[PDB]
Design an enzyme around this catalytic site. Structure first.
Site, PDB file in Angstrom:
ATOM      1  N   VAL C  59       0.783  -1.237   0.000  1.00 10.10           N
ATOM      2  CA  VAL C  59       0.000   0.000   0.000  1.00 10.10           C
ATOM      3  C   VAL C  59       0.814   1.285   0.000  1.00 10.10           C
ATOM      4  O   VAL C  59       0.324   2.318  -0.412  1.00 10.10           O
ATOM      5  CB  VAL C  59      -0.894   0.069   1.251  1.00 10.10           C
ATOM      6  CG1 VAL C  59      -2.244  -0.572   0.985  1.00 10.10           C
ATOM      7  CG2 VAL C  59      -0.195  -0.580   2.440  1.00 10.10           C
ATOM      8  N   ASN C  85      -8.100  -0.792   4.362  1.00  9.77           N
ATOM      9  CA  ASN C  85      -8.051  -1.556   5.572  1.00  9.77           C
ATOM     10  C   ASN C  85      -6.668  -2.157   5.863  1.00  9.77           C
ATOM     11  O   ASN C  85      -6.530  -3.066   6.679  1.00  9.77           O
ATOM     12  CB  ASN C  85      -9.153  -2.600   5.497  1.00  9.77           C
ATOM     13  CG  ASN C  85      -8.953  -3.715   6.461  1.00  9.77           C
ATOM     14  OD1 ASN C  85      -9.092  -3.544   7.669  1.00  9.77           O
ATOM     15  ND2 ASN C  85      -8.599  -4.876   5.938  1.00  9.77           N
ATOM     16  N   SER C 138      -9.546   2.844  14.190  1.00  5.99           N
ATOM     17  CA  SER C 138      -9.387   2.138  15.454  1.00  5.99           C
ATOM     18  C   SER C 138      -9.866   3.027  16.585  1.00  5.99           C
ATOM     19  O   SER C 138      -9.975   4.234  16.413  1.00  5.99           O
ATOM     20  CB  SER C 138      -7.913   1.755  15.691  1.00  5.99           C
ATOM     21  OG  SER C 138      -7.675   1.406  17.053  1.00  5.99           O
ATOM     22  N   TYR C 153       1.052   4.587  15.626  1.00  7.54           N
ATOM     23  CA  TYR C 153      -0.196   3.997  15.229  1.00  7.54           C
ATOM     24  C   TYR C 153      -1.355   4.996  15.479  1.00  7.54           C
ATOM     25  O   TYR C 153      -2.145   5.292  14.570  1.00  7.54           O
ATOM     26  CB  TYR C 153      -0.401   2.719  16.031  1.00  7.54           C
ATOM     27  CG  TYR C 153      -1.600   1.876  15.641  1.00  7.54           C
ATOM     28  CD1 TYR C 153      -1.633   1.169  14.427  1.00  7.54           C
ATOM     29  CD2 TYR C 153      -2.665   1.742  16.493  1.00  7.54           C
ATOM     30  CE1 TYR C 153      -2.715   0.347  14.084  1.00  7.54           C
ATOM     31  CE2 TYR C 153      -3.750   0.937  16.173  1.00  7.54           C
ATOM     32  CZ  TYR C 153      -3.782   0.233  14.973  1.00  7.54           C
ATOM     33  OH  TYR C 153      -4.882  -0.562  14.676  1.00  7.54           O
ATOM     34  N   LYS C 157      -4.181   6.422  12.887  1.00  7.72           N
ATOM     35  CA  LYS C 157      -5.601   6.070  13.052  1.00  7.72           C
ATOM     36  C   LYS C 157      -6.452   7.317  13.234  1.00  7.72           C
ATOM     37  O   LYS C 157      -7.535   7.433  12.618  1.00  7.72           O
ATOM     38  CB  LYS C 157      -5.818   5.098  14.199  1.00  7.72           C
ATOM     39  CG  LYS C 157      -5.105   3.760  14.030  1.00  7.72           C
ATOM     40  CD  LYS C 157      -5.805   2.912  12.997  1.00  7.72           C
ATOM     41  CE  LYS C 157      -4.877   2.565  11.852  1.00  7.72           C
ATOM     42  NZ  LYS C 157      -5.785   1.916  10.870  1.00  7.72           N
ATOM     43  N   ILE C 186     -10.016  -6.804  17.948  1.00  9.66           N
ATOM     44  CA  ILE C 186     -10.622  -7.810  17.069  1.00  9.66           C
ATOM     45  C   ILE C 186      -9.698  -9.023  16.983  1.00  9.66           C
ATOM     46  O   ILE C 186      -8.497  -8.882  16.768  1.00  9.66           O
ATOM     47  CB  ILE C 186     -10.902  -7.246  15.665  1.00  9.66           C
ATOM     48  CG1 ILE C 186     -11.720  -5.949  15.746  1.00  9.66           C
ATOM     49  CG2 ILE C 186     -11.651  -8.260  14.826  1.00  9.66           C
ATOM     50  CD1 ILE C 186     -13.102  -6.105  16.350  1.00  9.66           C
TER      51      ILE C 186
END
Lengths: 257, 255, 256, 257
Positions: C59, C85, C138, C153, C157, C186
């Site tokens: 990506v 995603n 998230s 992160y 997000k 998840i």
């Protein structure tokens, strides 16, 4: 042209420390509270240090007493400039099905109607004065925090408050009235600390914080003068571009709870 | 599967009753005016499913207790609550909004939300779980420009708070609580026959291409919101709780 | 019948998402870091009734993305649905101790990845006269800030939600709906990351004697769960929903 | 004692105002910017008005320059106490598909990587010193406003900044480091003035504000001195309990856009 402030729930906590803070900037203070003697004592102290102050006894959710307090204060000093909507109670915290309608009503009446009454009755004078500064004291509850066991009514009221603040910031900017919200975490006492709390076991999601949950002070509540200091800044001309903002004062506890 | 839907006489409430009935859900259509909810109940029984029309003012303890007792006594249980009932009440400048006008918006939108949840949670607990959606708005959540709409803003902002407390409080009983947040639906954003002095409170603005980007211009459909609620009270959404959701075609960001 | 690109589709939320979207007569381009996996999902999509292609690509790399999007239009002629995603957790460490390349890498995959994924697909979606985008974010950066050393992160997000809302307004007239999804844990625990160091330096210690995912008595959410919501957000069942975040966390998040 | 502050983007606007506001309370200032000469005259102005300043030339996206600038400042005055991460550029605003990868990269590098670098290098000095105060200047974009024409890349980095501030408020509470975010609206220039803006008609939702879109000032953008004032408050001891908080300084505008 010395500035005039109404400060509600002034008889103690943040309200009291706010009243001192502003008196020290030579702001003349109308200290309104639910108990004569406490509000008399702070007005006294303010006059003792050579300030200006009227104690005003009133129930914040009562229309007539409030009109009478506001009129009273404007008559003694001539104008109004600054308003701190601080009056509030925690009221009953209990499981949604155990919390009774009348006890729900009571938290809404003091915390929510009190905010409406406080503004409705003071905005006219501010509009006449050509402008001023409003702060309403809300909380982490209902803004960042949703865990305080069975505190729904309080939470509802405290979320309402920041919404009122942002609506009015816009309504009142053309009138040069600044409207801000201040959102404390635990001040002076634990976040959980309410003698009208019922059935904690049912509502609390259980949790242990081996190293406190107020990071900046190492587990300890913040102090009244901390909130005072912030309100003092937000009502001064130092904050002349600041309107319709909340400002969280929780030492990081909001981010935690 | 049994649902109580308040404000079910029209608009989002009517549309949600129909959509849910269509998924085989027994509907207790509740509302201010009897014939409105009679009609929505009739169309549902008339079209195949089971329903019952309930006449209650949502701010009134007593009617609400009866309304809930009666719905439980006819169908056995409760599984779904859509708390949708509410009013715009009067919008006016903060100094012109009367105490009693303020009290009435709070009575219906806020106290009525409380009561709605206050009375249905024991049934959803007994049934061992269920799904709640409260209907809020972009007012109080993203949007603070609707003229003199203070009291309304208040209640809408309150509701979202309620939703998040209750998601946590009730998670362990397997009750999911979410907030839906529509922008203008059917009628446009500021249409309220009780608006006073709009002059004095609106901040003047012009939207040459409209201000609902996705429908470039016009408001959304009640059936849109119904679809969302349907999804959110379904098992498809078993892990979603304590979330707000904005169904404003982007209008919430504009306003 | 319409066509969807799903990045990060080799597994987790991605795979589940490709599957559910197939199960709706939707032709899928499963794009992943490693081909063996994406052709594995694409295989399972075909011969189980449906149309699908596997795509290998990183990506964060302009050319490969440009390549693979080209390759998917050629095979099916259009694009209707993008699901961005792909992410890493990347290194989590004290801001003190996290290193420039490590930081850099989490920006490349999560942030640049998402910019690219939309950069090169929006144009086909406009040409189609509209479609649906969902970006998987998230609770980190949106409602949650205690994940030890996850700053990088968290940065990305949080930026994803901002991006969603900007483009929701930019692409409204093109009838492109743009939404965010914000999962809690998840499949796996929320601080579970093999590239996490100095956990005790960074983490505020906390004990959850009864879990911190309310609706599940504390078990992480399931990939199919998130997929189902994505599936709702791309369908015409959600014609009016755009520029919204939706949290799928079972309440964790209100808690973390 | 006398605290030492590092202000990045101290060349003009908010950074220069801040440097001066900070210096006025007797704070020693490392004024850092891209162009040596801009930060020479802000340093030189503070010096010989009684202050202590030094000019630091560095590109905030470059590890080695940043590391050296930060290091120089500690070598000169011995410690670091305050940090105002303010450097940023608007970059290119363009339709999502018009925006070139390289120019996307440019905005992230300066706005985002520059924030990481600024913090990563300064934080050890704050720890070492036993405490301190940080403020990242973000914007109404990405937090309240999302309509600035094709400003996606910019918007993205601003929203990341406020998320970092909250992670880091929690991570650094125990170390006694406060980290808050300031989000101004338009300041000095209109919300939408960017020479590198591109195809604005294709990206804007068209909109007209007959009475302007910043309430408290009758449509005018706020002053740098305004933001500086907030920053000054937030880095001082009058804010001991505030950490982890955004504050909007947009005269109402963020609620409009």
């Amino acid at each position: 042209p010395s500035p005039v402030a109404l400060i509600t729930g002034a008889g103690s906590g943040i309200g009291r420390a706010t009243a001192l803070a502003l008196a020290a900037d030579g702001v003349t203070v109308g200290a309104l509270g639910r108990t004569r003697t406490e509000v008399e004592e702070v007005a006294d102290e303010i006059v003792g240090a050579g300030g200006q102050a009227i104690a005003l006894e009133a129930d914040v959710s009562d229309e007539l007493q409030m009109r009478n307090a506001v009129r009273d204060l404007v008559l003694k000093f001539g104008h109004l400039d600054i308003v701190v909507a601080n009056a509030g109670i925690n009221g009953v915290w209990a499981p949604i099905d155990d919390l009774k309608p009348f006890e729900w009503d009571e938290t809404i009446a003091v915390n929510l109607r009190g905010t409406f009454l406080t503004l409705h009755l003071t905005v006219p004078y501010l509009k006449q004065r050509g402008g001023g500064a409003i702060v309403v004291v809300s909380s982490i509850n209902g803004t960042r925090t949703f865990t305080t066991p069975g505190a729904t009514a309080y939470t509802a009221t405290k979320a309402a408050q920041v919404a009122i603040v942002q609506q009015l910031a816009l309504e009142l900017g053309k009138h040069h009235i600044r409207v801000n919200a201040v959102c404390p975490g635990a001040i002076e006492t634990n976040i959980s600390d309410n003698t009208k709390l019922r059935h904690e076991e049912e509502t609390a999601i259980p949790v242990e914080w081996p190293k406190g949950q107020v990071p900046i002070t190492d587990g300890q509540p913040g102090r009244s003068e901390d909130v005072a200091e912030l309100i003092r800044f937000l009502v001064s001309e130092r904050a002349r571009h600041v309107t319709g903002s909340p400002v969280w004062i929780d030492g990081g506890q909001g981010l935690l709870r």
